[PDB]
Design a protein around this nucleic acid. Structure first.
Lengths: 138, 79
RNA sequence: GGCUCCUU
């Protein structure tokens, strides 16, 4: 369902701001909703669930990502890449997405939009490995 | 009072976002308040971000003047 | 809804 593309952008913006500012995610979410003038229950509620999921599982999400970074600490990643990966993991794994290909497409679109194609390849490459290890272990 | 809007640009987005981080930390450590950042779409390999400083003290300005941002990160302001 | 663009 296409409204989830917009919801992923909202959720990414919140995680990105949270990473940079360290303030209450609930308050950061309110800021983004007002700036983007989110007014539909579908996208507002899905964005809220993505953010709530990533925040509540943030330590495990970071560990899952690091397991596939070949020894690097997660602080090495750009702010765009690290938060796009956190969001991708939250949806694919913690919300057990039934449309994984669409998650990938929107996550990499975001990375390409706010960073570059080099960053998009890296995020796709890491997220794909994370996802295959998840599917395998399930 | 009156907000300061900063627009940052660069050709290295990791250094760009790290510079944003450093500005934010400096503002918060001196009792100021920020809004954003707003990442903007990359255009022709140039990355940009906008950050509003919505509350600041004279100490904020002093702290901000004493930081050195990486070469290659361009900063623009408006009130 | 174009259901991964594959480790900077």
């Amino acid at each position: 369902m296409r409204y989830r593309k917009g919801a992923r952008d909202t959720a990414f913006l919140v995680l990105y701001r949270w990473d940079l500012r360290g303030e209450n995610p609930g308050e950061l979410f309110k800021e983004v909703v007002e700036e983007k003038n989110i007014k539909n229950k579908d996208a507002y509620e899905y964005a809220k669930k993505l953010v709530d999921t990533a925040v509540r599982h943030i330590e495990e999400i970071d560990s899952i990502i690091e397991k596939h970074l070949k020894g690097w600490s997660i602080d090495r990643l750009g702010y765009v890449e690290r938060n796009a990966l956190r969001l991708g993991v939250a949806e694919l794994i913690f919300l057990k997405s039934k449309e994984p290909g669409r998650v990938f497409i929107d996550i990499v679109d975001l990375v390409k939009k706010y960073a570059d194609e080099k960053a998009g390849k890296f995020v796709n490459g890491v997220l794909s490995a994370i996802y295959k290890a998840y599917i395998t272990s399930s | 009072q009156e907000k300061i809007r900063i627009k940052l640009r660069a050709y290295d987005h990791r250094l760009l976002d790290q510079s944003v981080k450093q500005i934010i930390e400096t503002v918060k450590r001196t009792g100021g308040v920020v809004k954003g950042p707003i990442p903007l779409p990359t255009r022709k390999s140039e990355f940009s971000r906008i950050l509003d400083i919505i509350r600041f003290t004279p100490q904020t300005i002093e702290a901000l003047m004493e930081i050195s941002l990486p070469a290659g990160v361009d900063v623009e302001v408006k009130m």
